[PDB]
Each structure stands twice: as structure tokens, then as C-alpha cells.
Design a protein around this ligand. Structure first.
Ligand SMILES: Nc1ncnc2c1ncn2[C@@H]1O[C@H](COP(=O)(O)OP(=O)(O)O)[C@@H](O)[C@H]1O
Lengths: 287, 279, 67, 52, 68, 94, 50, 286
């Protein structure tokens, strides 16, 4: 009955398995279990996670086949590294950071089996460009609410960036006990390997591309900045003698001086000089 | 670092957008939009796009799962097809018509507003006509006046087609009227030509049968748009009908639509003239 | 894939595809397909989730009476 | 009338036909941008605010 | 957490000093009183506010924490 | 041997290389283009043959010093220009 | 602005035509897709503010 | 037989972690397993990985063992959860390849006809190479040369897996390996592009020097066939710059007129506006 500001050291490959499994079964609400171990009460670490096909029945405990799970665990023990089952994950396209009724029921069964069996919500469709949602919580018995509620223990760590969603708040999960803090095993020999090797552009900075599409691009650039000419024109005759900020607020035009700022012209200038320098560097290399 | 941060935060995605038409910009950082499936919903407007293309009732773009104001689509005609810019194309010029006149003097009167003369509408003190209803059968073609005139004085020509308009896109019917009206207002030389009003579009003697209320609401928004026009520009609107009896009084009353022209049968003398012209 | 119609081509990158039953979206096109194969007002298939053009399909109409 | 692309070299009694590259309209467009983005702004603004 | 940290810092600057140093001293003390009496604030903000009040009135204008 | 260093294959140079007459040069360079020896332009006002080869063969590995020297010349030029632009760019890269 | 896009990712807000303002911070409202959706009142606006 | 292979940014770190977790007791330095994926359009991709403990002896490189029943059960489970995934090849660490690879390929090719080998450098990060691909071709070394093994490298490029951009951005969130800060970022792009070009071409020069010394066997039959054209390609003729003296110099001079001047004018407008405001404030403050 002790749940402090717990933190999950989730692994990058566990993330990749999650996104691949969700991307495959987007509309099936595919299920899986998060292979982690309680090295202590709250510093839970997950190094691996597996993908399991949801049975036709749907979200059921028998859909996660016990014999198949046991054989998979034995295979991991023989090849790889063994790891305990103290959690689960589920692509949840329907709604957000909370659990459905059947998800709560199967998580209750997992809690009866395991010690915590954290309830993890990962939305595959909401994660598009920058925000992937991995929210973990615990189901509680009726005694936690009748005692001093908010099982969040006495510390100032789980209150950092703790913004449960409205649907999580109206549901019991993410409200029964607490919301678990997340952490990423960005260890070196792993993170340096990823940044050095995966995002690879090493001899691709030597591209010349003087005028492959750039003659017509310069035509478009001149046309766009001719529009800027009209805009910056329009501005200089607006230019009223009544504190022009007063005129500007009620007559925004998003012109060259205001919104189409010098940054865009700098982008055009950088593109030109980059092609210039690349062409000139290879010209002097041409010896 | 802050230049790097400023140029890093300027990603704004905006690739997989969806379309849900804007209603109006109530203020800055607040707005109200109406999606394609309806679901009118107040939203927050980002500062990236603003009045430059934030015209009141034009179809805009929204993000896939977010419905947020991201972009406004400039074109309006091809949103629901319903014909397009028939201008800049001589199909049937003018005097080459076989119907001679029928009257064609009220039609040249109707083209006076496209033929400039809005300045001459003032000073002299006249009030030029705004609507022209032609309650004639397919005699005289009833569209050889609109395919012409639009080329006699270079002006946009739109078929509209009333029969196509009455369909499942009844909720988007108001939006498409706004879009086609905006297309007209964009080009002061433009004439709206609506067809097949009598049988389908707001018959007034047979009771409302299901989607008839939807047609009445669509017509009502058409009245709203034609009253919002209020002679702001020199664009003209002409409906062509076989029988004006079933038409709604709201369009029929003066102040919205005044000039009623009947285009009768071939008129045997004129019929022989038509035969000579076509042959 | 969900079936829609090319409501508007918009541009070479983004296209307007309207589902047969309401919403229209500003989507991308299939990499293997080209605009000459897509065309305006032709039946196409959008990805169910990512909402992008996947394949274009021909359509037919039938009077199915007294044929 | 610009229907042909050549120059009549009467001294040699010939006409030198040249293939004119028309992709150089960026030049004229750039000049138009220079004219209508500088003349309309610099003289008007800094003659209105002569004193600063 | 920044709000509660600012409250703690403003209390720490205001320990052992009265309104003679700055007229804002009484304003901040009544601000601390009204935010500690305001129980609809966030858990972290309220926590820092109460710790701010405690360090401000540490010992009853009797003891102080000074680096000098 | 000459990576476009001597890209002017004049008639006299062809005569030195092949001890062939002037009329046979046309057929020889024709067959050279057909097989793939030289694929460049063939003039006759100056009789200049442009140099592109797309059918490599044995380069006398005992004489690999020549291509090694040309490759190290390219290395020295590339590194020297990289250092030169670095010298011009210390105001941003330092 | 990005968070506004993420808020809008749940449609943002929903337009409602307010009709009945009940005393217990309750407004009946009407939403074009469905219609009436009885709901509470926001904190920035009182019961009488409706 | 495949034209080329493309490696995802999806299995590289998984292989490295598998090396790390099974190297705790197995210090053979030799991690051998299978890479699963898909081959559709002469482009082979890898989507999953698996490691098996593996011991070697230097005696003729024929001492080894695996858990084939467990590995086959893994493959059945992976195909059951995702049918499109199939074993595209088998991978071994230790880029210094030994001789058991032929026996391993012969045994595993019953899962994949075009059996391929993959080497992952867990500890090495030489310039940017995460892994290398190998294709087995024993169909005569060359036209006039004796028999050999001759495992060639099929061209490999790091692919762009979908939906992993969110995770990698959240993971790093510190370097921002994107074109942000366009001018400085492209300067860095030019910098390591020159670094890579100098390093690789120096390596080619060293290889030519070592071929000249003859201490190593000479694979000239492809070296000169591929490098002669490289050397003779006429990128040194400058008369095409003479024909294109205004290659873009017209665009250079319009940008000077229309980017640097425009920046100067807008900065001037900001300053004179600020000067007017400051002068008015100073005169009308009291
Ligand atoms: N010179 C002409 N004079 C009159 N009618 C013509 C001439 N040339 C063609 N037409 C006919 O006029 C017809 C227009 O018919 P339609 O638009 O269907 O009638 P309505 O406008 O009443 O629906 C065309 O089908 C065309 O055959």
C-alpha cells in the first residue's frame, strides 16, 4: 500500500515495439504486456516489451494465451535475457489517458496476479509528431479512499508536470492512486549509438544543386518578394501619424515588416549562399 | 540558442489537414467553425494565418484530429463543382444567336451593370435592376443569353444547376452559396445563372415532403446572400425557370428580383429565322 | 482502405478527398501513383488511419431495371 | 516585331541568327521588385520623418 | 512549482525584515496569508506557500538564515 | 593517364598515338564510340575529341603510382581548401 | 499555439446555443450535430453570467 | 539476387541491446542471431531482431552451437503476431569475419533463399556506420581467377521507419538533428561532409598505396574498373564555367540587391522608428 513518486525506466526498443505494434493493429486495439521488474518499490525498470495478437473475443485475459506466454518467456530465457511481468501496455485509439471498463477489469486481474501490474495507456493515433502519451497508474481497493485519500505519498516529485487528462480524472484510473512519472534509459553506449548512427547524414552535406529547381525557385522568390514589395509599400502609406501601433493593431495585414519578417528573406538568402558556396567549393576542388 | 529555439519551434506540422468551413472570426485567439459533418464548434485561431485569407464565410482547412484553423482554401468554385469560370471563352458570342431578340433589350439592360454604367446608375439618379428572372420554356434556349452576354461583355458565367444542388449536401448548401457568391464578388464581371428551379427548388403549392424543408433553408440562405450583396459590386444574378408560379415570394418580391422576362415558343417568323441562323 | 472521391486536387502535394458520407480531408497521395493517374473527380481509396491516398478505383452505375 | 531572333550584319552581308534564352525574366522581375519596393517607401517615409 | 519556488524565495528575502525596508513587505505577507487561506490552489503551489510562510515567520522574528 | 588534363585530341596527336592517316581517323573514332573507348564530341575544324571512357581495363598495376599520385593530389587540394574555408570561417566556427 | 492545436485535437471547444440557465450551475445548451447537452458552468462565468 | 537492402532505424539499437544483455556471461565477442523483416520490390528491410548465445573456437572456425528450436518458436510467434515479417537474414557481430559464416548461412538459408549476413558494430561508431550488409556469391570469383568465397556487400542505406520520429525526438530532445538554425546547421553540414570526404578519400589513397606495396592481395579486377572512370570523368574542364560565367552570379547579385539590402533597409526602418520613439520620450517625459 506504498506508492511514492514512482518512475518507469522504459527502454527505447520497448517504445519501438509499442509503435510498431500499434501501427500494425491500429483499429484492433491490440494488447500486450510490459515486461518489467520491480528492482525496488518505485524505481521500476522495463527493458523489453512484446507484441501479442488480440484474440477475436477482444480484450480478454484468455486472449493473452498462458501457454503461449510461458513458451515466449522460456524462449527469452534461453536466448536473450529473462524479465518479469509486472505491467501491460495497450494501444488505445478510442479515447485518452484512462481505461475502458473491460481494460479496468483485466488490469484488476493483472493486479491480483502481480504486485502492482501498472495500467499503461499509450494512444497510437494521438501520437503523430511530437507528443506520445504513456500514462501509468494503479487500481486501488476501497480502503485507500476511506483512509487519507490521494495515495500520492509525501514528496514534491510526482507533482512535477502532473496533468492528468479530463477523461482520466472522471475515470478511476489516474485518479485512484497516482500518475507514474516516466523516464527514458538514455544510457551511453546506447544513446550515443543512436544519435551517431541512426540519424545519419555524413557525406550528404556536399550536395551542390545549383539550379536543379532553383531558376524557377528564384522566379517564385522574386514573385513572393514582389508581393512583399506591395505589402511593404502598403505599410509605408498606412504609416499614420496617430501612434502607428494603434493603426497596426486594428489593421493587421501580416506583411513583410510584420509577419513575413526578415527571417523568410534570410531563408532565401541562406539558400542562395549555400548553393553558391557549395558550387564554389567544388569549383576550387576541381583541380 | 534563442534563434535556434525560434527556428525549431516553427514546425507547425500542417501536412494532413481536413476541411471544415469557418463561420467568422469573433476575436483574436477565439473563433467558431463548422465542420463538414456539421458539429459547429468554437475553436482557437493560431496567429500563423489571419485576415489575409480569413474572409467571413469561405471554406477553410483544419487539422486531421484537431479541427484547428490551419489554412484557408482560396478556390471556391470547384468545392462542389457546379460549373466554373465560363469566361474568356467564346462559345456563342451574341448576335450569332438565332432567337434574335425575343426581347433581349431587358437583357442588354441587365448587362448594363456589367457593361460598366454603375457610375451612370448614379448621377442620373436611376436604380439599376439587380435580379432578372426568365420564366420561359426551353424556347430561345434560355441559356444562349447567359452563354452570350458573359462574352459580349467579358464576365464570369456559372451554371449552378438547381437539380444538382438539392442533395445530401444540404448542410453544405449554405456554405456553397457563400462560396459561389464569393467567387462572383471576386470578379465584378460575373453573372450567376441558376437552372431547373421550378420542379425541385422550392415549389410553393405542394406540402413539404421530407427534405423539402432543407431546400427551403438552402433557398433562405440564398436570399440571405443576395441581400448581403446589396449592390456592393457590379455582379449580376439571373435565374432561368420554366414556370415562376411555384417559386417562393421571397425571391419573387421586388427588392430582390424584379425583372421578369418570358421567352416564348419559336414564333414562326422567328422560328424560320432560327432555322436560317442554325443552318 | 476507405473509399472517397477527388473533390479537389488543390496542388501537387496536398489533395482534397471527400469520403462518400461527409468529411473531406487535405491528404497526401500514394508514392507510386501520380497526379495523371489520380485526376479530379475520380474514385480513390484513403488510408483508414493515416488518411492518405492509397489507390484509385473506377466506378460504375447501374439502372438495374428492365435490362 | 520580335517574330524572329537575329541581327542583320550588312557589313558581312549576312544575318547572324541567335537562339535567345528567355529564362532570364528573373532579371526584369527583380528590377521591378527593386523599383516598387524601394522608390515607393524610402522617399516618402524619410521625407515625412525628415527630423529624427 | 515555479510559483511555489517564487513564494519561498520572496519569503526568504523577507525574513527578519519589516515594511521599513520596502512598503511591499506587508503586501507580500498578506499575499502569503491569503494564499495559505486559499485552499483551491494547486498542491505544489499551496505547499510552497505554506513553507514560505513558515520560513518567513521562522521562530517569530527571532531566528534567521543568512549567508553573510 | 590524363584525367582530361589533355582533352584536345588533335589530328597530330592522333597521328602520334596511332600512326594512322587523316581519313582513317573518322572510322577509328567511330569504332571507338561504338565499342566504348571514347564517347566525347568529335570536331573537324580543330579535330578535337572530347575524353570520356566507360569501358575500363587493366591499368598496369605496376604503374599504379600515377593514379595514387593523382588521388593524393585530389586529397591535398580538398584538405587545403577545407582548411582555407575554415580559416575564412573562424568568425563563426570558433 | 501547439498546445492549442493539441487542445483542438479534441475539437477544442464545442459551439452551443444556450437556452436554459438553471440555478445549480447548469445550462441546457444546444449543439448542431446532436442538440441538447446538459452540463455544468465554467469557473470564469457565474450562474448569472449565463 | 536482391538489388539493394535498406536498414530501418528500428533494429540497430535492438541488436546492440541484445549484444549487451547476452554479453554479460558470453564474452566470446561473437553475437549471432537472425534479422527479420520484409523484401518486396528489390528493397529489403529489417523490422525485428533476435540474439542467440554463440561460442567459437579458432580451430578452423567450426565450433559453435545455437538454440534452433527456441529461435524457430520465436519466428513462429513473430509471424503469428505479424504475418508480413519474415527472416530476411542472419547477423553476426565482430566485423573481422571468420570462416564459420559459410556453415551458418548454409544452415539458416532454409528460412531465406537469398541468405544475407549483417554485421553490427555495437562498440565501434567509426564515422556513422551502424551496420553493414553482406550477400553470399560463390558463383566463380571472376572470369580468369580461382575459386573463392567472395562475400560481397550489397548496398545499404538507413531507411525512414514511420511513427518512430515521435519517439526519437522525445528521446534525444537535446541535439535536434534537424535543419534548425539554417545557416549554422548547413555550416555544420558542410563541415562533416568535408570531414567524411577527406577521411574516405584518404582511405582510398591508402588502399592504392598498399596495393602498390603489394603486402595485401590485390582485388584490382573491380578496383580499376570502378576507379578509372571516377578519375577520368571530366569535372576539371573550366570552359563550361566560361560558357556559364553567369552560372548563377546573376542570382548572386540580385540576392545582394534583394536580401542584404532588404535586411539593411528593414533594420534601418526599425532603428529610425526606435530613434523617433526614444527622442519623443526624452522630450515629452517631463
Ligand atoms: N442560335 C440559337 N438560338 C436559340 N437556341 C439555340 C441556338 N443554338 C443552340 N440553341 C439551343 O438552346 C438550348 C438551350 O437549352 P436549355 O439550356 O436546356 O434550356 P433551359 O435554359 O430552359 O433549361 C441548347 O440545347 C441548344 O441546342
Amino acid at each position: 500500500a506504498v506508492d511514492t513518486a514512482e518512475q518507469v525506466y522504459i527502454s527505447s526498443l520497448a517504445l519501438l515495439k509499442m509503435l510498431k505494434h500499434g501501427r500494425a493493429g491500429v483499429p484492433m486495439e491490440v494488447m500486450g504486456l510490459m515486461l518489467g521488474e520491480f528492482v525496488d518499490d518505485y524505481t521500476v525498470r522495463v527493458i523489453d516489451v512484446f507484441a501479442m495478437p488480440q484474440s477475436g473475443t477482444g480484450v480478454s485475459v484468455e486472449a493473452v494465451d498462458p501457454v503461449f506466454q510461458a513458451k515466449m518467456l522460456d524462449m527469452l530465457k534461453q536466448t536473450g535475457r529473462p524479465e518479469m511481468v509486472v505491467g501491460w501496455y495497450h494501444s488505445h485509439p478510442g479515447f485518452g489517458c484512462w481505461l475502458s471498463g473491460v481494460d479496468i477489469n483485466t488490469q484488476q486481474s493483472f493486479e491480483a496476479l502481480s504486485e502492482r501490474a501498472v495500467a499503461v495507456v499509450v494512444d497510437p493515433i494521438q501520437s503523430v509528431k511530437g507528443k506520445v502519451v504513456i500514462d501509468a497508474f494503479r487500481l486501488i481497493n476501497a480502503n485507500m479512499m476511506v483512509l487519507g485519500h490521494e495515495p500520492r505519498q509525501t514528496t514534491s516529485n510526482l507533482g512535477h508536470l502532473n496533468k492528468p487528462s479530463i477523461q482520466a480524472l472522471i475515470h478511476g484510473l489516474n485518479r485512484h492512486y497516482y500518475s507514474i512519472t516516466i523516464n527514458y534509459r538514455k544510457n551511453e553506449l546506447e544513446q550515443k549509438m543512436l544519435l551517431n548512427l541512426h540519424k545519419k547524414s555524413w557525406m550528404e552535406g556536399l550536395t551542390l544543386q545549383d539550379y536543379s529547381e532553383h531558376c524557377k525557385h528564384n522566379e517564385s522568390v522574386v514573385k513572393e518578394m514582389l508581393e512583399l514589395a506591395k505589402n511593404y509599400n502598403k505599410a509605408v502609406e498606412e504609416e499614420d501619424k496617430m501612434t502607428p501601433e494603434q493603426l497596426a493593431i486594428k489593421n493587421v495585414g501580416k506583411q513583410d515588416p510584420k509577419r513575413h519578417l526578415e527571417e523568410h528573406v534570410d531563408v532565401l538568402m541562406t539558400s542562395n549562399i549555400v548553393q553558391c558556396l557549395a558550387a564554389m567549393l567544388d569549383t576550387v576542388v576541381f583541380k | 540558442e534563442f534563434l535556434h529555439a525560434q527556428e525549431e519551434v516553427k514546425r507547425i506540422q500542417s501536412i494532413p489537414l481536413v476541411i471544415g468551413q469557418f463561420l467568422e472570426a469573433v476575436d483574436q485567439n477565439t473563433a467558431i467553425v463548422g465542420s463538414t459533418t456539421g458539429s459547429n464548434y468554437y475553436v482557437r485561431i493560431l496567429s500563423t494565418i489571419d485576415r489575409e485569407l480569413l474572409k467571413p464565410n469561405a471554406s477553410v482547412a483544419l487539422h486531421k484530429h484537431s479541427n484547428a484553423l490551419v489554412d484557408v482554401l482560396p478556390p471556391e468554385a470547384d468545392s462542389s463543382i457546379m460549373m466554373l469560370t465560363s469566361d474568356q471563352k467564346p462559345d456563342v458570342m451574341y448576335a450569332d444567336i438565332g432567337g434574335m431578340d425575343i426581347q433581349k433589350q431587358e437583357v442588354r439592360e441587365a448587362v448594363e451593370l456589367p457593361l460598366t454604367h454603375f457610375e451612370l446608375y448614379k448621377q442620373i439618379g436611376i436604380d439599376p435592376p439587380r435580379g432578372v428572372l426568365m420564366y420561359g420554356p426551353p424556347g430561345c434556349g434560355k441559356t444562349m443569353l447567359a452563354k452570350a452576354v458573359a462574352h459580349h461583355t467579358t464576365a464570369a458565367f456559372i451554371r449552378v444547376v438547381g437539380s444538382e444542388f438539392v442533395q445530401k449536401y444540404l448542410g453544405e448548401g449554405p456554405r456553397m452559396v457563400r462560396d459561389v457568391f464569393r467567387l462572383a464578388k471576386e470578379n465584378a464581371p460575373a453573372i450567376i445563372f441558376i437552372d431547373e428551379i421550378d420542379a425541385i427548388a422550392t415549389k410553393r403549392f405542394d406540402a413539404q415532403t421530407g427534405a423539402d424543408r432543407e431546400v427551403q433553408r438552402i433557398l433562405l440562405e440564398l436570399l440571405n446572400q443576395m441581400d448581403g450583396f446589396d449592390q456592393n459590386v457590379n455582379v449580376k444574378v439571373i435565374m432561368a425557370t420554366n414556370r415562376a408560379d411555384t417559386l417562393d415570394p421571397a425571391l419573387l418580391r421586388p427588392g430582390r428580383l424584379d425583372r421578369k422576362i418570358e421567352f416564348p415558343l419559336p414564333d414562326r417568323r422567328q422560328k424560320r429565322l432560327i432555322f436560317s441562323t442554325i443552318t | 482502405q476507405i473509399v472517397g472521391e477527388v473533390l479537389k486536387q488543390l496542388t501537387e502535394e496536398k489533395f482534397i478527398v471527400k469520403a462518400t458520407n461527409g468529411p473531406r480531408y487535405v491528404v497526401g497521395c500514394r508514392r507510386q501513383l501520380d497526379k495523371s493517374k489520380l485526376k479530379p473527380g475520380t474514385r480513390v481509396a484513403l488510408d483508414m488511419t493515416t488518411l492518405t491516398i492509397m489507390r484509385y478505383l473506377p466506378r460504375e452505375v447501374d439502372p438495374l431495371v428492365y435490362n | 516585331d520580335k517574330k524572329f531572333h537575329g541581327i542583320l550584319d550588312q557589313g558581312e552581308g549576312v544575318l547572324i541568327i541567335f537562339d535567345e534564352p528567355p529564362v532570364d525574366k528573373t532579371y526584369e522581375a527583380a528590377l521591378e521588385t527593386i523599383q516598387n519596393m524601394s522608390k515607393v517607401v524610402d522617399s516618402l517615409y524619410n521625407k515625412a520623418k525628415k527630423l529624427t | 512549482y515555479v510559483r511555489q519556488g517564487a513564494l519561498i524565495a520572496s519569503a526568504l528575502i523577507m525574513i527578519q525584515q519589516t515594511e521599513i525596508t520596502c512598503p511591499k513587505v506587508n503586501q507580500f505577507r498578506q499575499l502569503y496569508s491569503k494564499v495559505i487561506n486559499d485552499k483551491h490552489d494547486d498542491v505544489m503551489a499551496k505547499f510552497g506557500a505554506i513553507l514560505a510562510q513558515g520560513i518567513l515567520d521562522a521562530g517569530g522574528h527571532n531566528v534567521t538564515i543568512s549567508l553573510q | 593517364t590524363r584525367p582530361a588534363n589533355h582533352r584536345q585530341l588533335t589530328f597530330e596527336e592522333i597521328a602520334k598515338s596511332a600512326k594512322i592517316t587523316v581519313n582513317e581517323v573518322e572510322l577509328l573514332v567511330m569504332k571507338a564510340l561504338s565499342v566504348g573507348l571514347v564517347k566525347g564530341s568529335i570536331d573537324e575544324v580543330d579535330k578535337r575529341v572530347h575524353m570520356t571512357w566507360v569501358q575500363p581495363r587493366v591499368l598496369d598495376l605496376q604503374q599504379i603510382k600515377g593514379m595514387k599520385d593523382r588521388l593524393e593530389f585530389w586529397c591535398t587540394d580538398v584538405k587545403s581548401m577545407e582548411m582555407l574555408v575554415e580559416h575564412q570561417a573562424h568568425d563563426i566556427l570558433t | 499555439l501547439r498546445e492549442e492545436l493539441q487542445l483542438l485535437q479534441e475539437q477544442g471547444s464545442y459551439v452551443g446555443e444556450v437556452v436554459r440557465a438553471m440555478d445549480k450551475k447548469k445550462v441546457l445548451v444546444k449543439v448542431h450535430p446532436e442538440g441538447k447537452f446538459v452540463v455544468d458552468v465554467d469557473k470564469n462565468i457565474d450562474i448569472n453570467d449565463v | 539476387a536482391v538489388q539493394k537492402v535498406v536498414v530501418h532505424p528500428l533494429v540497430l539499437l535492438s541488436v546492440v541491446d541484445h549484444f549487451n544483455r547476452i554479453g554479460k556471461v558470453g564474452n566470446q565477442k561473437r553475437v549471432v542471431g537472425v534479422l527479420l523483416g520484409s523484401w518486396q520490390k528489390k528493397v529489403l528491410d529489417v523490422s525485428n531482431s533476435f540474439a542467440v548465445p554463440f561460442d567459437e573456437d579458432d580451430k578452423d572456425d567450426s565450433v559453435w552451437f545455437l538454440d534452433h528450436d527456441y529461435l524457430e518458436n520465436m519466428y513462429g510467434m513473430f509471424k503469428k503476431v505479424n504475418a508480413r515479417e519474415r527472416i530476411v537474414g542472419w547477423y553476426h557481430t565482430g566485423p573481422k569475419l571468420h570462416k564459420n559464416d559459410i556453415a551458418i548461412n548454409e544452415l539458416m538459408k532454409r528460412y531465406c533463399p537469398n541468405s544475407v549476413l549483417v554485421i553490427i558494430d555495437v562498440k565501434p561508431k567509426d564515422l556513422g556506420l551502424p551496420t553493414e550488409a553482406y550477400i553470399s556469391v560463390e558463383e566463380v570469383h571472376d572470369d580468369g581467377t580461382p575459386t573463392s568465397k567472395t562475400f560481397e556487400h550489397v548496398t545499404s542505406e538507413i531507411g525512414a521507419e514511420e511513427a518512430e520520429e515521435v519517439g526519437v525526438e522525445h528521446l534525444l530532445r537535446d541535439i535536434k538533428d534537424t535543419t534548425v538554425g539554417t545557416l549554422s546547421q548547413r555550416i555544420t553540414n558542410q563541415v562533416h561532409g568535408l570531414k567524411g570526404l577527406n577521411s574516405k578519400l584518404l582511405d582510398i589513397r591508402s588502399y592504392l598505396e598498399k596495393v602498390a606495396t603489394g603486402k595485401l592481395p590485390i582485388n584490382h579486377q573491380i578496383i580499376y574498373q570502378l576507379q578509372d572512370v571516377f578519375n577520368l570523368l571530366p569535372d576539371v574542364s573550366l570552359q563550361e564555367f566560361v560558357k556559364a560565367f553567369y552560372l548563377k552570379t546573376n542570382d548572386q547579385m540580385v540576392v545582394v540587391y534583394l536580401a542584404s539590402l532588404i535586411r539593411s533597409v528593414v533594420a534601418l526602418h526599425n532603428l529610425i522608428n526606435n530613434k523617433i520613439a526614444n527622442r519623443d520620450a526624452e522630450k515629452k517625459e517631463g
